[PDB]
Design an enzyme around this catalytic site. Structure first.
Site, short mmCIF file in Angstrom:
data_model
loop_
_atom_site.label_atom_id
_atom_site.label_comp_id
_atom_site.label_asym_id
_atom_site.label_seq_id
_atom_site.Cartn_x
_atom_site.Cartn_y
_atom_site.Cartn_z
CG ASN A 1 5.24 -3.70 -14.74
OD1 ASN A 1 5.02 -4.98 -15.88
ND2 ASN A 1 3.90 -4.10 -13.65
CB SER B 1 -1.57 -6.30 -7.13
OG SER B 1 -2.40 -6.04 -7.73
CD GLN C 1 -0.99 -1.23 -12.14
OE1 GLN C 1 -0.11 -1.83 -13.25
NE2 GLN C 1 -2.23 -1.32 -12.85
C1 LIG Z 1 6.28 -7.38 -5.02
C2 LIG Z 1 5.65 -5.68 -5.24
C3 LIG Z 1 5.86 -5.30 -6.78
C4 LIG Z 1 3.99 -4.18 -6.89
N1 LIG Z 1 4.47 -4.27 -8.20
C5 LIG Z 1 3.53 -2.77 -8.66
C6 LIG Z 1 3.85 -2.59 -9.58
O1 LIG Z 1 4.94 -3.13 -10.72
N2 LIG Z 1 3.13 -1.78 -10.42
C7 LIG Z 1 1.62 -0.81 -9.05
O2 LIG Z 1 1.44 -0.10 -10.05
N3 LIG Z 1 2.50 -1.32 -8.14
C8 LIG Z 1 3.04 -2.22 -7.62
N4 LIG Z 1 3.03 -2.32 -5.93
C9 LIG Z 1 1.29 -2.66 -5.74
C10 LIG Z 1 1.86 -0.99 -5.02
O3 LIG Z 1 3.34 -1.11 -4.28
C11 LIG Z 1 1.40 -0.12 -4.07
O4 LIG Z 1 0.05 -0.38 -4.68
C12 LIG Z 1 1.32 1.22 -3.68
O5 LIG Z 1 3.08 0.77 -2.51
C13 LIG Z 1 0.53 1.58 -2.43
O6 LIG Z 1 0.80 2.31 -1.93
P1 LIG Z 1 -0.16 3.69 -0.79
O7 LIG Z 1 1.48 5.07 -0.46
O8 LIG Z 1 -1.62 2.76 -1.17
O9 LIG Z 1 0.59 3.05 0.16
P2 LIG Z 1 2.29 2.55 1.67
O10 LIG Z 1 3.31 2.66 1.03
O11 LIG Z 1 2.23 1.37 2.39
O12 LIG Z 1 2.48 3.50 2.28
C14 LIG Z 1 0.90 3.90 3.19
C15 LIG Z 1 2.18 5.28 4.16
O13 LIG Z 1 1.13 5.44 5.37
C16 LIG Z 1 1.78 5.94 6.21
N5 LIG Z 1 1.38 4.58 7.32
C17 LIG Z 1 -0.16 4.43 7.52
N6 LIG Z 1 0.27 3.37 8.63
C18 LIG Z 1 0.54 4.57 9.86
C19 LIG Z 1 0.23 5.61 10.66
N7 LIG Z 1 -0.73 4.66 11.31
N8 LIG Z 1 0.29 6.73 11.43
C20 LIG Z 1 1.52 7.85 10.03
N9 LIG Z 1 1.74 6.88 8.97
C21 LIG Z 1 1.23 5.54 8.34
C22 LIG Z 1 3.50 4.41 6.09
O14 LIG Z 1 4.02 4.76 6.95
C23 LIG Z 1 2.99 5.13 4.43
O15 LIG Z 1 4.32 6.30 4.48
C24 LIG Z 1 4.15 -3.72 -5.31
C25 LIG Z 1 3.75 -4.49 -4.97
C26 LIG Z 1 4.91 -4.79 -3.96
C27 LIG Z 1 4.82 -5.56 -2.21
N1 LIG Z 2 1.87 -5.14 -9.82
C1 LIG Z 2 2.75 -5.72 -9.90
C2 LIG Z 2 2.96 -6.45 -8.30
O1 LIG Z 2 2.18 -6.15 -7.38
O2 LIG Z 2 2.96 -7.85 -7.96
C3 LIG Z 2 2.92 -6.88 -11.06
F1 LIG Z 2 2.92 -6.60 -12.04
F2 LIG Z 2 3.61 -7.90 -11.16
F3 LIG Z 2 1.35 -7.76 -10.60
#
Ligand SMILES: Cc1cc2nc3c(=O)[nH]c(=O)nc-3n(C[C@H](O)[C@H](O)[C@H](O)COP(=O)(O)OP(=O)(O)OC[C@H]3O[C@@H](n4cnc5c(N)ncnc54)[C@H](O)[C@@H]3O)c2cc1C
Ligand SMILES: N[C@@H](C(=O)O)C(F)(F)F
Ligand SMILES: Cc1cc2nc3c(=O)[nH]c(=O)nc-3n(C[C@H](O)[C@H](O)[C@H](O)COP(=O)(O)OP(=O)(O)OC[C@H]3O[C@@H](n4cnc5c(N)ncnc54)[C@H](O)[C@@H]3O)c2cc1C
Ligand SMILES: N[C@@H](C(=O)O)C(F)(F)F
Lengths: 363, 363
Positions: free
Chosen positions: A56, A337, A341
């Site tokens: 969210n 986190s 968003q």
């Molecule tokens: C429990 C939980 C709750 C969350 N709830 C929220 C929420 O409600 N709202 C919100 O905004 N966010 C939320 N988040 C945070 C959000 O999940 C993360 O900020 C977001 O997914 C980060 O995305 P990213 O693309 O930066 O990284 P990632 O999704 O980690 O993707 C990294 C990408 O790089 C690739 N990669 C890494 N290293 C290599 C390598 N050496 N070579 C090739 N590929 C590689 C990986 O395979 C993947 O494709 C939550 C996360 C969790 C764990």
């Molecule tokens: N963004 C989510 C988290 O990464 O857990 C929260 F909304 F729950 F805080």
């Protein structure tokens, strides 16, 4: 003798940030190739963070503490509003947000963005806590990523499963790479970012018609949240284990999360009892955070790497020579986190950086 | 109206232990289906341990401390001897093993197994350390697993990529399951083993013709080893981070490992210098260990699970009823740093358990 594209870009990473960046670039007419270990179909992979989000829209910083974050969040909210008619985003009306004190409400900076923003009476807050209510938005994290991948497909972007250990492996077929590797940024030679850190988040996915979102940060000993997502499911959290890499499910944490979430909203249960909660799955994801905040900036790098640039460079420590080229690396990682968003606004900033670099260095 | 097999078994896990178990069972005529998240082709996946091993034969316990371990190691050595003619195992002649003291040499229990076992003069040991020399064996860990998978293919075993969260998901198509999930055993409902723990191992893969193996445990502040493997490569270690889940490469650890390994054997370098070492890859794997030692035993379990059996059971906490069946679960996990060198003997014990269970419960 065909007229070939001069706008080739590689996007390293296929989480919500690499996908969003790739999509705006594709929309701008760039030829985009996505290289990543984990792809949108990997909905239960713990080696990236994007399948595990709520996801969210919950601002976590004041304007002064996170000016970029707020910018990115405001832009992404607008994008998600546009996705409600087709179901890729869903309204969380009457969302309830609890904090320990006024300061935890972050200056109410987003009260013009979330409709019907208003303080909550103490009677509607946990004992001794303060609260506000508003309408926010949520997306189905893995399905949202799959949605972006479909959009990318139509725009001609391509995908390739690959695990990179050194930058030159990513600069194959493109002189500009978008680095959206999350935690991976620390161990890729040529990036070597020691500031990258995980923040462990354990949750319980529950089957429930509950459509009410509750974010509770009023109890410092027990982080808790209930985030409904498209599909008749709710995600109950949670944890924020800074620097914790543990991918195993903590059974005690399960109890605390469900008990607390039940306090917050009994309708997550069939009978208002913990035993009445329909558990679908126990999840543990690692948020890709970064000391010093998210990194969104363009860097000019000389290839091949030498052991002076990176302690992890491949080959012998003694290196030079042939060949030798300069390339552009646009960082986009460490969203912690708030990756979802912030994803659209961040992608916007990434795409502007790529445009700028292309003007200055790639013709 | 065909005569169908009555010896269906599911093997949960496709690391060296699940593969070895599956192969001996297939050889015994069982119909084997392998369910696993990580498969032998996933040679750089950090969510299982088997791609990261040396993998050599280095006993780590006395007979009294590890009677099973020794049994398993002795049997596996015999198997690996048989694989030398076809190159699936390779002799490490004149292996050098250093310890802090006589006790670290484990009673020399294996001196009848490793040819040419003999103590080393202090002049051929690190200062103040004690040592022995012998001929041992090593396998190419990911290729060894691929070798086992090929053997399994010919015997009619099948493979399926799947990630299980609850036991009943594994008891699909079989009334007996071999649980070879490594660290996964802790978070699967119906197993819930809190004793499972990782032991982090960082290494440097190096390009080198060095064929000499050196195992040094004489410096408690710096674990070090050089393990040549088939192919003109050597693995330099290492670390033993008990309970450490960190999958990122530690640059300081790199320096310590290479410096120490260079002390031990300068020929790992082209010019006997750290800068002369040809680095191929930086690796981090999590050994799947278990407090209380490896678990190899058969358990009788009633399905479906209830919240009384497992805190992680799916559905509502209040559960009973229909249907209801008893099945056999044969555990095989927690081999820590000795999964390869123990794999064949362990698989033998697993296969005997399956035979026994089939006799007592499956006809
Ligand atoms: C429990 C939980 C709750 C969350 N709830 C929220 C929420 O409600 N709202 C919100 O905004 N966010 C939320 N988040 C945070 C959000 O999940 C993360 O900020 C977001 O997914 C980060 O995305 P990213 O693309 O930066 O990284 P990632 O999704 O980690 O993707 C990294 C990408 O790089 C690739 N990669 C890494 N290293 C290599 C390598 N050496 N070579 C090739 N590929 C590689 C990986 O395979 C993947 O494709 C939550 C996360 C969790 C764990
Ligand atoms: N963004 C989510 C988290 O990464 O857990 C929260 F909304 F729950 F805080
Ligand atoms: C750096 C390092 C050096 C080593 N060197 C040596 C050595 O020289 N000699 C030696 O003997 N050993 C060595 N080892 C130890 C050896 O790697 C491990 O003991 C062995 O790989 C354990 O094999 P396993 O099959 O038990 O587990 P793993 O290889 O971890 O396989 C577990 C299997 O279960 C699957 N699984 C887990 N959970 C689930 C789930 N929920 N659902 C579906 N599937 C699931 C996984 O995907 C995978 O298929 C080393 C290990 C490392 C890290
Ligand atoms: N078995 C290896 C380990 O897991 O690191 C060792 F031989 F190097 F010890």
């Amino acid at each position: 003798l065909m007229m070939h594209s001069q706008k080739r870009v590689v996007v390293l990473g296929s989480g919500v940030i690499g996908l969003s960046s790739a999509l705006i670039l594709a929309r701008k007419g760039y030829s985009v190739h996505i290289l990543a270990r984990d792809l949108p179909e990997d909905v239960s992979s713990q080696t990236f963070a994007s399948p595990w989000a709520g996801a969210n829209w919950t601002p976590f910083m004041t304007l002064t503490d996170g000016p970029r974050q707020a910018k990115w969040e405001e832009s992404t909210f607008k994008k998600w509003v546009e996705l409600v008619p087709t179901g890729h985003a869903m309204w969380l009306k009457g969302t309830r947000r609890f904090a320990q004190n006024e300061d935890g409400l972050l200056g109410h900076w987003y009260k013009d963005i979330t409709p019907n923003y208003r303080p909550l009476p103490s009677s509607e807050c946990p004992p001794g806590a303060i609260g506000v209510t508003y309408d926010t938005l949520s997306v189905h994290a893995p399905k949202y990523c799959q949605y972006l991948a479909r959009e990318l497909q139509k725009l001609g972007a391509t995908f390739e499963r690959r695990t990179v250990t050194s930058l030159e492996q990513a600069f194959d077929g493109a002189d500009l790479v978008v680095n959206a590797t999350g935690l991976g940024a620390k161990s890729i030679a040529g990036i070597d970012d020691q500031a990258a850190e995980p923040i462990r988040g354990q949750t319980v996915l529950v089957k429930s018609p509950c459509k009410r979102c509750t974010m509770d940060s009023s109890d410092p000993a027990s982080p808790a949240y209930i985030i409904p997502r498209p599909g008749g499911e709710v995600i109950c959290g949670g944890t924020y284990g800074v620097g914790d890499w543990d991918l195993s499910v903590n059974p005690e944490t399960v109890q605390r999360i469900l008990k607390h979430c039940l306090r917050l909203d009994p309708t997550i249960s069939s009978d208002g009892t913990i035993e009445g909660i329909e558990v679908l799955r126990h999840n543990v994801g690692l948020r890709p955070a970064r000391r010093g905040g998210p990194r969104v900036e363009a860097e000019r790098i000389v290839l091949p790497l030498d052991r002076t640039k990176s302690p992890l460079s491949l080959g012998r420590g003694s290196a030079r020579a042939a060949k030798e080229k300069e390339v552009t690396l646009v960082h986009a990682y460490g969203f912690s986190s708030a990756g979802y968003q912030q994803s659209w606004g961040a992608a916007e900033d990434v795409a502007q950086l790529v445009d700028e670099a292309f003007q200055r260095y790639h013709g």
